[PDB]
A paper describes a structure:
TERB1 is a molecular scaffold that simultaneously interacts with TERB2 and shelterin subunit TRF1. Knockout of any components of the TERB1–TERB2–MAJIN (TTM) complex impairs the telomere–NE attachment and results in infertility in both male and female mice. In the present study, we characterize the TERB1–TERB2 and TERB2–MAJIN interactions and determine the crystal structures of the N-terminal domains of TERB2 and MAJIN in complex with TERB2-binding motif of TERB1 and MAJIN-binding motif of TERB2, respectively. To reveal the structural basis for the interactions between TERB1 and TERB2 and between TERB2 and MAJIN, we crystallized the TERB1587–659–TERB22–116 and the TERB2119–220–MAJIN2–149 complexes and determined their structures using single-wavelength anomalous dispersion (SAD) method at resolutions of 3.3 and 2.9 Å, respectively.
To gain further insight into the telomere recruitment function of the TTM complex, we first characterized the interaction between TERB1 and TERB2 using bimolecular fluorescence complementation (BiFC) assay. We found that a short fragment of TERB1 consisting of residues 587–636, which is adjacent to the TRF1-binding motif (TERB1TBM, residues 642–656) of TERB1, was necessary and sufficient for binding with the N-terminal domain of TERB2 (residues 1–116). The TERB1T2BM–TERB2NTD complex adopts a compact globular fold, resembling a single folding unit. TERB2NTD consists of a three-stranded β sheet (β1–β2–β3) at one end and six α helices that flank the β sheet and scatter at the periphery of the structure. TERB1T2BM is a helix–turn–helix (HtH) motif with a long tail that folds back to the middle turn between the two helices. Notably, Cys592 and Cys595 at the N-terminus of the tail together with Cys618 and His621 in the middle of the HtH motif chelate a Zn2+ ion, playing a key role in defining the overall shape of TERB1T2BM. TERB1T2BM adopts an extended conformation and packs against the concaved surface of TERB2NTD, burying ~1400 Å2 of surface area at the interface. The long helix H2 of TERB1T2BM fits into a large hydrophobic groove formed by helices α3 and α6 and loops L33 and L56 of TERB2NTD through extensive contacts involving a panel of hydrophobic residues at both sides of the interface. Helix H1 and the N-terminal tail of TERB1T2BM pack against a flat hydrophobic surface of TERB2NTD formed by the β sheet and helices α3 and α5. Most notably, a cluster of acidic and polar residues in TERB2NTD (Asp55, Glu58, Asp59, and Gln110) mediate a network of salt bridge and hydrogen-bonding interactions with positively charged residues in helices H1 and H2 of TERB1T2BM (Arg605, Arg629, Lys632, and Arg636), helping secure the HtH motif of TERB1T2BM on the surface of TERB2NTD.
Author numbering:
A (entry chain A): 4 to 110
B (entry chain B): 590 to 649
Write the structure that this text describes.
């Protein structure tokens, strides 16, 4: 049983794969999996500013998680944590903080 | 190699369980330490926006 929704800005390919394979597939408003290929001004904002996101009851994953699984053997491997999709207002600083060298660590 | 989110392969893990998974995990990789701290900042500011606004008053 794996319910999952997709913001408007998601490739139909990814939605098709979700339909085709997984647990029992369903795609309601609330769901169990929150997928998106965007975090700027799509439907996804309605997650980020929900109380569930504030109270750690909602994590948005990048819908390319499904692409990674489709190009894996079946469903094995492909940990979710790699596809955490944070709010776009954070991403600029997340990249830099990760990319920076040890002699920099600017903050 | 143990590190939640990088070994997040087990079934039943989803968007409701995940945030609590990492927080509960004794050992976290740098990438997820960064993302978590970044997300906590965002969530803090939503809360502090609700409690501050510019008009909301604190009165019994
Ligand atoms: Zn990790």
């Amino acid at each position: 049983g794996q319910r999952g929704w997709f913001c408007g800005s998601v490739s139909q390919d990814l939605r098709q794969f979700w339909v085709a394979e997984g647990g029992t597939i369903s795609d309601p408003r609330a769901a169990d999996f929150l997928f998106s290929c965007d975090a700027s001004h799509p439907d996804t904002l309605r997650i980020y500013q929900s109380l569930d996101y504030i109270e750690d009851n909602a994590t948005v994953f990048h819908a390319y998680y499904l692409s990674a699984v489709a190009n894996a053997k079946i469903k094995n491997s492909v940990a979710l944590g790699h596809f955490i999709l944070p709010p776009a207002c954070l991403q600029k600083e997340i990249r830099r903080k990760i990319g920076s060298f040890i002699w920099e660590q600017d903050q | 190699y143990r590190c939640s989110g990088c070994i997040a392969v087990e079934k039943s893990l989803n968007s409701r369980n995940f945030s609590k998974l990492l927080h509960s995990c004794p050992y976290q990789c740098d990438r997820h330490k960064v993302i978590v701290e970044a997300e906590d900042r965002y969530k803090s500011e939503l809360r502090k926006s609700l409690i501050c606004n510019k008009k909301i008053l604190l009165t019994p």
